[PDB]
Copies of this chain bind each other. A is one copy, B any other.
């Protein structure tokens, strides 16, 4: 009495495979405040 859910994991693996990209997209943005967060602190210290 099945119903074909073959399209389901075919849909979501494109979804969950996409989520690593937009995961990796933000990490390249957060390090900008990381590096600039403390080279400010050098110039304040000296």
Chain A residues packing against B (C-beta within 8 Å):
1-5, 7-16, 18-46
- With most chain B CB atoms within 10 A of its CB, the pick from A5, A8, A26 is A26
Contact of A8 among B3, B16, B22, B41 (CB under 8 A): B22
Query: Hey, which chain B residues are within 8 Å of A36, CB to CB?
Result: 23, 26-27, 42, 45-46
How close is A11's CB to chain B, nearest CB, in angstroms?
A: 2
Q: Given A33-B43, A42-B32, A3–B12 Cβ distance below 8 Å? A: no
Check A1 against B5 for contact (C-beta < 8 Å): no
Q: Say yes or no: A2-B9 contact (C-beta < 8 A), given A19-B42, A41-B33.
A: no
Is the Cβ of A11 less than 8 Å from the Cβ of B31?
yes
